Design a protein around this ligand. Sequence first.
Ligand code: B42
Length: 557
Amino acid sequence: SMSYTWTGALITPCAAEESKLPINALSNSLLRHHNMVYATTSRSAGLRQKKVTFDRLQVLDDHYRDVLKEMKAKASTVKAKLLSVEEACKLTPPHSAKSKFGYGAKDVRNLSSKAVNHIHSVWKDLLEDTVTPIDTTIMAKNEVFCVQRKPARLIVFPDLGVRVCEKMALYDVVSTLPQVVMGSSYGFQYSPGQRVEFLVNTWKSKKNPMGFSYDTRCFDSTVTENDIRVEESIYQCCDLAPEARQAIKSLTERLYIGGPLTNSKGQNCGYRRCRASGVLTTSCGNTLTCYLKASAACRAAKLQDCTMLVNGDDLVVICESAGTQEDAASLRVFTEAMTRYSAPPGDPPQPEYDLELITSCSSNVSVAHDASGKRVYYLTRDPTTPLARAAWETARHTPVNSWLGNIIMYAPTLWARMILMTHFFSILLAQEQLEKALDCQIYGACYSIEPLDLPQIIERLHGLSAFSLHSYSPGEINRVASCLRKLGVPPLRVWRHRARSVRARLLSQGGRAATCGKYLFNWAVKTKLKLTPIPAASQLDLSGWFVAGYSGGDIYH
Ligand SMILES: CC(C)CC[C@]1(C)CN(C2CCCC2)C(=O)C(C2=NS(=O)(=O)c3cc(NS(C)(=O)=O)ccc3N2)=C1O
């Protein structure tokens, strides 16, 4: 069937949208080539609609069904709980889209009776009605990139009342089931460092390793009614409260499978018959579906000693090589199988024999050296998008601070330490806002973070190693340097000078600020200080951080 049907009514914005990089007094210090940075807007949504609208055919064989059976057996060992209204409410981001029914995200969070009462009525309707399509809003995402222009991605989401009900029925399931079903292949369980460890150990476990990333073209669009029903049957394998079962069946039939699309003006835009990007099950359903099709495809292709790593629609496979000719042939068969299962490639997969050249979750393993001169593996990425976004965030206040998420996740990297840390700490010093908590997103979930806690966060997730890495690789150094020329970012020599100042200012304020100076900026000085475990690090509740993915799932921790 067709992934979407359209009426012709436009995908509309709520407010005016900026496409050009906003400029203030801080902009030039980060980036000179302002015309390279842009934000997607609803004005390019038509282009996206064209891309994501196609017919899906699906041919399902024994490998597919055998894997599904295996998945269901593991799923049947899961016991999941219902969340109460209150518990579900507390998982709502404070900035989440307001309800059509007279209350907003903050009314939800502080548990106002107006919000609670409507949510209760939404839940009761779900239990009582299992057929009536649930309304969704379709919007264009405003995301920032460097020119290479990408059309706006589309986001489809039900009302806030429904979203709370999703959490009630499914939060525990989507949080716990994926790891039980997929084990070590479940990508969202890993910190960046645990991800490196798993990739490195998997690579080393092969006699002659070969790996490939598989990019599905518009994965959400390739998801069929069969696929969404199949995932529900996996959910229903769980030990569940009777009301949970009913709500999940109702949400599947009324929401997850498909439904009408309404713009911000209230106009009918058409109909969806594929994955909605803005539902709680987006991450879990995509992960299960990608794992299922790929596992089956590995068997169809007779890939030898396969290990898969799956993060929603993001797939990487490591296996035993049979030489370049048989590998290329094997990947073609893999691709044919995926295509039959309705997961055809965007860019065709290519075999890689250098682990450091495999990109997965926009990232690659690379190598540097710790204090002892001991080689350490770490996760990095091309910094172009992080830096484009940091430029936007320098001149504009944003709901989500990608710079802070990036500092957390990519703390060991040369670009995050020299540029991002230096730049944004300078900004926070000048404003005296070091102590002000800011929102960031990690694996789709929203977190409120104090910048002064960064040293403890980084020590916990990465180890004290992240403050002492040196002698990065030539390929990594070249990629960063190339990126800075492209965007017109000052050379790393300027950043070292800046960091010396940022460091000194932080130290001169004592307490948590000086701790930021000492650990975060120890790289900047010639005569570095001895770095010991920070006492207050084993205190913050980092439980829930790397449990699951929640893209579009409207989750706050
Ligand atoms: C392994 C880590 C380091 C990758 C970080 C990276 C690139 C970026 N970030 C943050 C931005 C600021 C810093 C961290 C992420 O959370 C994700 C990431 N976020 S996510 O929305 O959970 C996600 C979704 C999907 N696909 S889906 C829509 O769930 O089917 C694939 C992959 C992902 N991965 C990412 O993939």
